[PDB]
Short mmCIF file of C-alpha atoms in Angstrom, two decimals:
data_model
loop_
_atom_site.label_atom_id
_atom_site.label_comp_id
_atom_site.label_asym_id
_atom_site.label_seq_id
_atom_site.Cartn_x
_atom_site.Cartn_y
_atom_site.Cartn_z
CA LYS F 2 15.31 13.84 4.23
CA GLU F 3 16.09 15.37 1.01
CA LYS F 4 16.05 13.05 -1.71
CA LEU F 5 12.84 10.32 -1.21
CA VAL F 6 10.51 7.85 -3.85
CA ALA F 7 6.65 7.47 -3.02
CA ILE F 8 5.56 4.85 -5.18
CA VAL F 9 2.01 4.91 -5.36
CA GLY F 10 -1.27 3.09 -7.39
CA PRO F 11 -4.22 0.85 -7.10
CA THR F 12 -3.96 -2.66 -5.50
CA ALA F 13 -3.00 -5.65 -6.94
CA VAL F 14 -0.94 -3.62 -9.20
CA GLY F 15 2.36 -4.70 -8.34
CA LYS F 16 3.82 -2.42 -6.48
CA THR F 17 5.43 -4.78 -3.41
CA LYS F 18 6.92 -6.54 -6.42
CA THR F 19 8.77 -3.19 -8.47
CA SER F 20 9.23 -2.31 -5.16
CA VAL F 21 11.40 -4.76 -3.56
CA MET F 22 13.21 -4.51 -6.78
CA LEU F 23 13.91 -1.22 -7.39
CA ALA F 24 15.40 -1.33 -2.81
CA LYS F 25 18.18 -3.81 -4.61
CA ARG F 26 18.59 -2.04 -7.17
CA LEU F 27 19.37 1.13 -5.63
CA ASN F 28 19.77 0.38 -1.72
CA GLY F 29 16.49 1.45 -0.08
CA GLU F 30 14.47 0.43 2.54
CA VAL F 31 10.62 -0.10 2.08
CA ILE F 32 8.27 2.38 4.45
CA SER F 33 4.53 1.31 4.20
CA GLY F 34 2.86 3.48 3.86
CA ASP F 35 -0.88 0.70 3.70
CA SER F 36 -1.39 1.17 7.50
CA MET F 37 -3.80 -2.17 7.63
CA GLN F 38 -0.42 -3.32 6.76
CA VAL F 39 0.43 -2.31 11.14
CA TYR F 40 -2.15 -5.13 12.04
CA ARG F 41 0.18 -8.36 13.55
CA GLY F 42 -2.23 -11.78 13.48
CA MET F 43 -3.64 -10.06 10.90
CA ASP F 44 -2.27 -11.03 7.70
CA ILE F 45 -4.62 -12.75 4.89
CA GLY F 46 -7.37 -9.82 5.04
CA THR F 47 -4.71 -7.85 5.19
CA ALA F 48 -1.79 -8.58 2.85
CA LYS F 49 0.55 -9.33 4.21
CA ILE F 50 4.39 -8.86 2.88
CA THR F 51 6.17 -12.20 3.75
CA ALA F 52 9.62 -12.84 4.65
CA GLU F 53 9.44 -14.24 1.67
CA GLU F 54 8.22 -11.50 -1.53
CA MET F 55 9.88 -8.81 1.01
CA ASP F 56 13.65 -10.34 -0.24
CA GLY F 57 15.97 -8.87 2.09
CA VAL F 58 14.92 -5.46 1.71
CA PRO F 59 14.02 -4.57 5.33
CA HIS F 60 10.84 -2.47 5.61
CA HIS F 61 9.02 -0.57 8.80
CA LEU F 62 5.71 0.54 9.60
CA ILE F 63 4.20 -3.48 9.68
CA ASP F 64 3.45 -5.22 12.69
CA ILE F 65 4.01 -2.72 15.30
CA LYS F 66 -0.02 -2.09 16.66
CA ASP F 67 -1.56 -4.67 18.09
CA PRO F 68 -5.99 -4.94 16.14
CA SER F 69 -7.72 -3.19 18.60
CA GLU F 70 -5.84 -0.06 18.32
CA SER F 71 -6.32 3.13 15.79
CA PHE F 72 -3.12 3.98 13.52
CA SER F 73 -4.33 7.80 12.32
CA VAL F 74 -2.61 9.62 9.57
CA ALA F 75 -1.12 11.63 12.60
CA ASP F 76 0.42 8.73 13.62
CA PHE F 77 1.66 7.79 11.12
CA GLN F 78 3.30 10.60 9.88
CA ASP F 79 5.18 10.47 13.26
CA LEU F 80 7.06 7.47 12.44
CA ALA F 81 7.21 8.07 8.37
CA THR F 82 8.97 11.42 8.97
CA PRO F 83 12.21 10.29 11.64
CA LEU F 84 12.23 6.66 9.16
CA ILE F 85 13.23 8.88 5.62
CA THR F 86 15.83 11.01 8.07
CA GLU F 87 17.01 7.55 10.07
CA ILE F 88 17.05 5.84 6.11
CA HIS F 89 19.45 8.28 4.76
CA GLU F 90 21.83 8.00 7.96
CA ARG F 91 22.52 4.36 7.56
CA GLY F 92 23.11 5.35 3.91
CA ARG F 93 19.61 3.55 1.71
CA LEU F 94 17.04 5.59 -0.39
CA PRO F 95 13.74 5.58 1.88
CA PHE F 96 11.50 4.34 0.15
CA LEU F 97 7.69 5.09 0.60
CA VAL F 98 5.20 2.13 -0.87
CA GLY F 99 1.77 2.74 -1.10
CA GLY F 100 -0.45 3.91 1.04
CA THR F 101 -3.66 6.76 0.94
CA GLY F 102 -3.58 10.02 -0.98
CA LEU F 103 -4.28 11.47 2.36
CA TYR F 104 -1.24 9.52 4.64
CA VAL F 105 0.88 9.82 1.82
CA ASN F 106 -0.02 13.82 0.94
CA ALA F 107 0.87 14.35 4.54
CA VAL F 108 4.72 13.47 5.11
CA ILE F 109 5.22 14.63 1.09
CA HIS F 110 4.10 17.69 2.35
CA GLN F 111 4.95 17.49 6.12
CA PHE F 112 1.31 18.91 6.67
CA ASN F 113 0.76 20.21 9.55
CA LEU F 114 -1.55 18.02 11.87
CA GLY F 115 -3.97 18.77 15.13
CA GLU F 185 -0.48 22.01 -2.77
CA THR F 186 3.15 23.46 -2.29
CA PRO F 187 5.96 22.05 -3.47
CA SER F 188 7.80 18.87 -1.45
CA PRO F 189 10.49 19.87 0.99
CA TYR F 190 11.67 16.00 0.20
CA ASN F 191 13.49 15.21 -3.09
CA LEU F 192 10.33 13.33 -4.32
CA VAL F 193 10.29 11.21 -7.23
CA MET F 194 7.12 9.79 -7.26
CA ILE F 195 5.71 7.52 -9.48
CA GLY F 196 2.61 5.84 -10.18
CA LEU F 197 1.86 1.76 -11.39
CA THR F 198 -0.98 1.40 -13.17
CA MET F 199 -3.14 -1.78 -14.66
CA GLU F 200 -5.40 -1.94 -18.38
CA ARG F 201 -8.92 -1.55 -16.21
CA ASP F 202 -10.08 -4.85 -16.68
CA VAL F 203 -7.01 -6.76 -16.17
CA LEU F 204 -6.91 -4.71 -12.41
CA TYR F 205 -10.03 -5.27 -11.51
CA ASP F 206 -9.71 -9.31 -12.58
CA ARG F 207 -6.64 -10.35 -10.47
CA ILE F 208 -8.78 -8.12 -7.11
CA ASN F 209 -11.52 -10.65 -7.60
CA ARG F 210 -8.98 -13.69 -7.91
CA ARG F 211 -7.13 -11.46 -5.07
CA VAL F 212 -10.15 -12.05 -2.77
CA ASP F 213 -10.48 -16.00 -3.84
CA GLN F 214 -6.79 -16.45 -2.40
CA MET F 215 -7.99 -14.70 1.01
CA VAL F 216 -11.10 -16.84 1.18
CA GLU F 217 -9.14 -19.90 0.46
CA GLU F 218 -6.48 -20.09 2.81
CA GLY F 219 -8.68 -18.25 5.61
CA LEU F 220 -9.34 -15.92 5.59
CA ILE F 221 -13.18 -16.51 7.14
CA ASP F 222 -11.63 -17.83 10.13
CA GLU F 223 -9.04 -14.83 10.95
CA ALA F 224 -12.13 -13.14 10.97
CA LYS F 225 -14.88 -15.49 13.00
CA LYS F 226 -11.37 -15.48 15.61
CA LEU F 227 -11.05 -11.63 15.73
CA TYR F 228 -14.88 -11.76 16.47
CA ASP F 229 -14.52 -13.07 18.55
CA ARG F 230 -12.11 -11.99 20.75
CA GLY F 231 -14.01 -8.99 20.93
CA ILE F 232 -11.64 -7.08 18.49
CA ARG F 233 -14.49 -5.11 17.23
CA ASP F 234 -15.50 -0.89 16.88
CA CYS F 235 -12.13 0.78 15.34
CA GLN F 236 -10.20 0.84 12.04
CA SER F 237 -8.96 -2.70 11.66
CA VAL F 238 -12.80 -4.23 11.76
CA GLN F 239 -13.91 -1.26 9.95
CA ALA F 240 -10.47 -1.96 7.21
CA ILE F 241 -12.60 -2.13 3.65
CA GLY F 242 -11.66 -6.09 4.00
CA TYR F 243 -12.78 -6.79 7.01
CA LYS F 244 -16.28 -5.75 7.40
CA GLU F 245 -17.55 -7.13 4.87
CA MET F 246 -16.71 -10.66 7.15
CA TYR F 247 -18.82 -8.74 10.39
CA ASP F 248 -21.24 -7.80 8.26
CA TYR F 249 -20.85 -11.96 7.53
CA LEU F 250 -19.97 -13.21 11.21
CA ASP F 251 -23.20 -10.35 12.44
CA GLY F 252 -25.96 -12.62 9.96
CA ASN F 253 -26.77 -9.99 7.69
CA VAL F 254 -25.76 -11.64 4.35
CA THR F 255 -24.33 -14.78 3.20
CA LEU F 256 -21.07 -16.40 2.75
CA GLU F 257 -20.87 -15.40 -1.16
CA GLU F 258 -23.27 -12.70 -0.74
CA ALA F 259 -20.67 -10.63 1.59
CA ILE F 260 -16.81 -12.57 -0.90
CA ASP F 261 -18.97 -10.97 -3.85
CA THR F 262 -18.94 -7.60 -2.29
CA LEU F 263 -15.60 -7.59 -0.33
CA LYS F 264 -14.78 -7.84 -4.11
CA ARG F 265 -17.58 -4.95 -5.60
CA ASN F 266 -16.25 -2.59 -2.48
CA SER F 267 -12.59 -3.67 -3.48
CA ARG F 268 -13.33 -2.41 -7.05
CA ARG F 269 -14.90 0.26 -6.28
CA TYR F 270 -11.21 1.27 -3.84
CA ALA F 271 -8.92 0.52 -6.31
CA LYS F 272 -11.13 2.60 -8.82
CA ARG F 273 -11.25 6.04 -6.47
CA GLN F 274 -7.62 5.44 -5.18
CA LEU F 275 -6.09 5.29 -9.25
CA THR F 276 -8.67 8.56 -10.26
CA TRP F 277 -7.67 10.77 -6.99
CA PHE F 278 -3.59 10.15 -7.50
CA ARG F 279 -3.87 10.34 -11.66
CA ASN F 280 -5.24 14.18 -10.20
CA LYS F 281 -2.14 15.11 -8.33
CA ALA F 282 0.74 15.53 -10.71
CA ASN F 283 4.58 15.65 -10.57
CA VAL F 284 3.38 11.43 -10.64
CA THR F 285 5.01 9.33 -13.33
CA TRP F 286 3.17 6.75 -14.34
CA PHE F 287 3.24 2.85 -15.50
CA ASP F 288 1.66 0.54 -16.51
CA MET F 289 2.76 -2.54 -15.85
CA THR F 290 -0.63 -5.48 -17.67
CA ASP F 291 0.84 -8.44 -18.38
CA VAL F 292 4.16 -6.91 -18.83
CA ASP F 293 7.41 -7.86 -18.24
CA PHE F 294 9.67 -6.94 -14.74
CA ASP F 295 11.81 -7.64 -16.19
CA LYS F 296 11.68 -4.94 -18.86
CA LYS F 297 9.60 -2.57 -17.29
CA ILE F 298 12.07 -2.47 -13.90
CA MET F 299 15.06 -1.40 -15.82
CA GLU F 300 12.84 1.38 -17.41
CA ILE F 301 11.89 2.68 -13.89
CA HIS F 302 15.37 2.35 -12.55
CA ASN F 303 16.81 4.22 -15.31
CA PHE F 304 13.88 6.76 -14.85
CA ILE F 305 14.57 7.22 -10.67
CA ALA F 306 18.38 7.32 -10.80
CA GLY F 307 17.66 10.06 -13.30
CA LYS F 308 15.41 12.68 -11.26
CA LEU F 309 17.43 11.89 -8.31
CA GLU F 310 20.36 13.51 -9.43
CA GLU F 311 19.27 16.05 -12.64
CA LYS F 312 16.74 17.80 -9.29
CA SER F 313 20.08 18.25 -7.72
CA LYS F 314 21.25 21.31 -9.31
#
């Protein structure tokens, strides 16, 4: 539990893509910070990373809990910390990818769950993009979920009796349940889903923009075959210098 790299930023910015590429370049394993990734079966509404895009990079904290259970910042910390140390035993570089400002702050700062420098040699990188392009990608993102069957996924979970639990209250399924309940029309739900997504991305981008020690790289219409070398080098470099 010495070295560690963290990749933060709003949704649809390329965290996963940039993530797996850096892993292949720095012999690392990915530890997901997006709690929503834990609920198995729920793959469309959560934008669960697939084995394809995951490439050959091993990932943790994905599909480890049922949609009916919860995943507190504590449950995350109890699994995240042991994994960081275990990853190092194999010789790989642990990569914390995504999650809310809360989850990341609890692991990188070893919160006492029941400000000061991190006990790790962390390399926090942030991925930004031009406000418009970000919103546009988020809206399009939602369209794909609807065309992929998001609606039917929700309905099925709805009929199963899954409710009153974070998994369903998630800022991705609550909109659909509001539709199924009969409070709004389908299109209104979908739109509100895009609206709640754009607002969230924003909230997270400002949150991390606040916390210092975060190096920013803005992708936005960039060649990953270029940016990657930029980030790669920066990370490799910063890790070695700090170890005086």
